[PDB]
């Protein structure tokens, strides 16, 4: 259904990516480098429906809900690189923040051979549907915590690509102009 397409765990902008320009490329990828300390913030991605491209066409072709928002990450580490972050990774448009976000939906990942995580964001929103408008559905934040750990090694930098999905509901509602098309 349309849903597998939006659905089948796609990859994401998410943001514009301080690019190589690898960051189109990327998209899915925040950066993973070592770090002077580990706790410092490196990201803050904003989610809509609108914005980042795969989400965009679907969102215009509809303007209601049914769904959830699953973001599952994957890693290109090495023997030699390793890595860990934690990602929020945030419903709807709260606190913008550290602990508030940790307080959020939650996943803790090891980035070793697992090569996949499920951080799923739900739309925790007063109404079942949010319509397509400009300000924001809300933020997804990532925090890279501890880098990479290592070897000799791997050129230093490691990268992740984020994955996006919704359930439960697969099904939305109200079709509207789809981003792609003719005239």
């Amino acid at each position: 259904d349309l849903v597998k397409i939006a659905q089948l765990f796609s990859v994401m902008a998410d943001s514009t990516t301080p690019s190589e320009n690898h960051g189109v490329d990327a998209k899915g990828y925040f950066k993973w480098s070592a770090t002077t300390a580990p706790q410092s913030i490196v990201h803050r991605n904003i989610v809509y429906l609108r914005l980042f491209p795969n989400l965009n066409v679907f969102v215009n072709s509809y303007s209601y809900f049914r769904g959830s928002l699953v973001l599952r990450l994957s890693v290109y580490a090495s023997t030699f690189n390793r890595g860990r972050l934690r990602m929020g990774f945030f419903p709807n448009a709260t606190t913008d923040s550290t602990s508030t976000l940790d307080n959020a939906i939650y996943t803790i990942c090891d980035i070793g051979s697992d090569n996949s995580f499920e951080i799923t964001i739900p739309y925790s929103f007063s109404t079942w549907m949010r319509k397509t408008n400009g300000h924001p559905i809300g933020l997804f934040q990532i925090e890279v915590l501890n880098r990479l750990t290592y070897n000799s090694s791997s050129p230093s930098e490691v990268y992740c690509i984020v994955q996006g999905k919704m359930g439960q509901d697969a099904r939305f509602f109200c079709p509207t102009g789809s981003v792609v098309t003719f005239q």
Epitope: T36, A37, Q39, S40, S97, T98
Partner: antibody, heavy 122, light 108 residues
Framework: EVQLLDSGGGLVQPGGSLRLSCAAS????????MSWIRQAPGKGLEWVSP????????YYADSVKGRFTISRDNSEGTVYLQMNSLSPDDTALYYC????????????????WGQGTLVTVS | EIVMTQSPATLSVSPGERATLSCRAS??????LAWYQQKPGQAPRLLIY???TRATGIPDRFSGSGSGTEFTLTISSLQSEDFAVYYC?????????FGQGTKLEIER
Amino acid sequence: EVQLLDSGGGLVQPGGSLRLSCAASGFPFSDYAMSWIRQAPGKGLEWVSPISGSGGRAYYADSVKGRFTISRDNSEGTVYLQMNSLSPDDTALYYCAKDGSGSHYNNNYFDSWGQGTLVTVS
Amino acid sequence: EIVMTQSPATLSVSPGERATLSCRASQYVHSTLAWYQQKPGQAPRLLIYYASTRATGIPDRFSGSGSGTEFTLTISSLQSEDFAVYYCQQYNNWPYTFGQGTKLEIER
């Protein structure tokens, strides 16, 4: 218009401890990062510590490490340095300063300095 | 361990002439470099940040360029009030650090 006003510095014995304060105005204080930088007689400027917004992450220079502690009061928009373990190398004129990251980069440029408080650890 | 270094420890320039201050770094710093001017007994003054953007209230005779590990502060026609010490500083990585300063003195 940024006004960074600094009090609290005075002559102190070695092994002593001072608490410097610097109060800010005319900018949204609680969004900006803030640093203390000092200036020794017969010396240039050394950044000492900076604190990040929420009073979250703070960093220090190796000289100052465990001796000095940086704390913000955002409810009164003030900045604090607690200088323990004072040695003569700490004699200086201390300035509070306000840094900004601009748009979405990683550099923090200072845009306003205060007037200077003198700490004579002798 | 990022260390900045200003070549002219003291620049003696005639009034009205131009002056050029250099500031290298021991590792790449991209464009997060800023320049400061300091008169005796006063707080420092921000002249340039982002390597090249002039701050508000800074005349056009002041200008900065360069990137990486090498920067320059050019002042077109040095005026009487441009008599001072100048410091560069980088913010590309912690801890943040300043140069040892360049003293621009009136040459006669």
